[PDB]
Design a protein around this ligand. Structure first.
Ligand SMILES: *C(=N)[C@H](C[C@@H]1CCNC1=O)NC(=O)[C@@H]1[C@@H]2[C@H](CN1C(=O)[C@@H](NC(=O)C(F)(F)Cl)C(C)(C)C)[C@@H]1C=C[C@H]2C1
Length: 304
């Protein structure tokens, strides 16, 4: 029993981290096969960040300007290309630690593990959700650029995020591994703000099911509700609309506990309208929305 925010084991991604240097800028790269992926603002200096034309800046860059370092050992760059907001540096050695992998673009509400890195070396690992406003509530300093977000399916690492930047509210923005930003953000030092940070309703419900599984069920009331009637209440508290797809995805948890999704919705409804009254659910004084239904199942059934 017990329920914790849990990252995937990071060993397979640690073997892919390298340091990339160009000019005075040092940041992290991801080395998979004979390619290093990193954020394109490696090309920029402190002057350039206001309004850089990345294509023009790239004209002045040769292969030998890019120093790539795995541990103490240097990798020879034999080619470079810009793909959207990432740079692909072709090197002459394939990574011997390349795990089984693919690049996925995740959906909002889905979660992943972040291996926060500085100078190509790991600082630590934590779990994040892609917020509905396409930001993440991370922990990143200067130098963290190129740190990656991933999930693991048995042996296959799915890379979903590369870190690029921090927004005014202390939240973070980045790209998929094809260099496309999540959200409307650009890799430019200009006025940018996150939209309204809404709660991932289906995840809250998943977490309530986790609470019940762990014996922490004081919040279960005697009411039920309808999907439309719950959704009216959701809208008021900036909760995302609950759909029938979300109901179906909660089915495994509903079946294990014997509590229908709409019964749980009615208990959530009461927590929204009355608050928690100083009480906790799984050691938390607020409602947690960064556990997917799949996250809950995995932790409660001991998937490896
Ligand atoms: C990468 N090393 C670094 C990570 C940042 C630094 C502090 N916390 C982080 O996560 N990235 C940057 O410095 C990027 C960089 C610059 C400016 N920038 C920012 O994150 C800046 N933010 C913004 O401009 C904003 F999000 F739009 Cl408000 C700032 C935090 C330094 C003010 C250009 C924009 C993105 C890349 C190029």
């Amino acid at each position: 029993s017990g329920f914790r925010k849990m990252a995937f084991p990071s060993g397979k991604v640690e073997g892919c981290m390298v340091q990339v240097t160009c000019g005075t800028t040092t940041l992290n790269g991801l080395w998979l096969d004979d390619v290093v992926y990193c954020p394109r603002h490696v090309i920029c200096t402190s002057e350039d960040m206001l309004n850089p034309n990345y294509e023009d800046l790239l004209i002045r860059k040769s292969n030998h300007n890019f120093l790539v370092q795995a541990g103490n050992v240097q990798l020879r760059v034999i080619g470079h290309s810009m793909q959207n907001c990432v740079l692909k540096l072709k090197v002459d050695t394939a990574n011997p630690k390349t795990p089984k992998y693919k690049f996925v673009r995740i959906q909002p509400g889905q979660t992943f593990s972040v291996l926060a890195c500085y100078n190509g070396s790991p600082s630590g690992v934590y779990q994040c959700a892609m917020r509905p406003n396409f930001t993440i509530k991370g922990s990143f300093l200067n130098g963290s650029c190129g740190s990656v977000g991933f999930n693991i399916d048995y042996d296959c690492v799915s890379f979903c995020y590369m870190h690029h930047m921090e927004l005014p509210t202390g939240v973070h923005a980045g790209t998929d591994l094809e260099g496309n930003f999540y959200g409307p953000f650009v890799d430019r030092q200009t006025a940018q703000a996150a939209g309204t940070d809404t709660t991932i309703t289906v995840n809250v419900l998943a977490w309530l099911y986790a609470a019940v599984i762990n014996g922490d069920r004081w919040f279960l009331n005697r009411f039920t509700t309808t999907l439309n009637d719950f959704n009216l209440v959701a809208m008021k508290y900036n909760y995302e609309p609950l759909t029938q797809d979300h109901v179906d995805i909660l089915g495994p948890l509903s079946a294990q506990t014997g509590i229908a999704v709409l019964d749980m919705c009615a208990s959530l409804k009461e927590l929204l309208q009355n608050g928690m009254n100083g009480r906790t659910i799984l050691g938390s004084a607020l409602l947690e929305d960064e556990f997917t239904p799949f996250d809950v199942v995995r932790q409660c059934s001991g998937v490896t």
